[PDB]
Amino acid sequence: TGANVTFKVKGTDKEFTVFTTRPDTLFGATFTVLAPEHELVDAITSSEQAEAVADYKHQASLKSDLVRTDLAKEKTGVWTGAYAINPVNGKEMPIWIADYVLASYGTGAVMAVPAHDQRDWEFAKQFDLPIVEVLEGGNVEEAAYTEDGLHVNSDFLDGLNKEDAIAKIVASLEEKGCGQEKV
Numbered sequence: 001t002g003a004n005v006t007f008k009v010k011g012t013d014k015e016f017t018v019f020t021t022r023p024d025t026l027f028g029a030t031f032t033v034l035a036p037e038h039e040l041v042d043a044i045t046s047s048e049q050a051e052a053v054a055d056y057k058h059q060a061s062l063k064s065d066l067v068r069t070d071l072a073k074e075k076t077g078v079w080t081g082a083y084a085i086n087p088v089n090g091k092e093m094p095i096w097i098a099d100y101v102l103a104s105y106g107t108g109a110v111m112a113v114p115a116h117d118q119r120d121w122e123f124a125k126q127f128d129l130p131i132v133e134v135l136e137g138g139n140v141e142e143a144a145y146t147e148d149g150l151h152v153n154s155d156f157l158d159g160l161n162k163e164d165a166i167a168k169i170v171a172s173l174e175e176k177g178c179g180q181e182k183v
């Protein structure tokens with residue numbers, strides 16, 4: 001039981017969809033990550049970033065799934081040169097490629113929530129990216145908080161728990177056709 005969320009690419013007519021198990025953390029998504037092998041990558045990569053993106057894709061194709069999803073391995077990646085638009089508030093989120101996202105699982109794209117996902121937190125720490133708390137109970141600057149808590153910094157989701165918030169955001173994204181529940 002997860003959800004699909006669709007993001008527009010700024011300044012283009014392109015879109016991608018991510019698979020998320022925590023659509024309730026949408027207001028804490030500070031960047032997005034595509035698998036280096038994702039089909040959209042070449043289309044949205046800027047000319048300044050083209051060669052670095054090509055180099056990283058080659059490096060990534062030489063690593064197995066197991067090696068890539070290994071928690072202990074240093075996070076790596078490169079900015080595509082593009083930005084995604086958060087449907088709930090129009091906020092820009094830089095689009096990165098990174099090998100800890102796998103092409104074959106879900107859609108091959110994620111929304112990164114460094115405050116509440118360990119791998120995303122490690123990436124943000126490696127690359128000096130913003131970390132935004134959306135569930136209280138932890139100290140997200142020092143460690144990802146992966147448990148239940150009341151929602152904050154999340155507009156209409158404020159004060160709800162995981163169950164209630166997921167139900168509300170999913171129902172709200174469906175209304176707009178920016179997302180739906182998915183198995």
Ligand SMILES: Nc1ncnc2c1ncn2[C@@H]1O[C@@H](COP(=O)(O)O)[C@@H]2O[B@-]3(OCc4ccc([C@H](O)c5ccccc5)cc43)O[C@H]21
Binds near residue numbers: 019103109
């Ligand atoms: N292709 C992909 N490669 C790597 N990671 C991917 C991926 N596609 C989706 N993801 C990330 O993992 C899925 C779910 O994994 P699962 O099916 O094993 O439960 C995630 O949904 B996530 O979207 C935003 C989010 C916030 C917080 C978490 C966090 O780890 C969490 C998740 C559940 C309970 C408590 C904490 C996970 C995600 O990151 C995605």
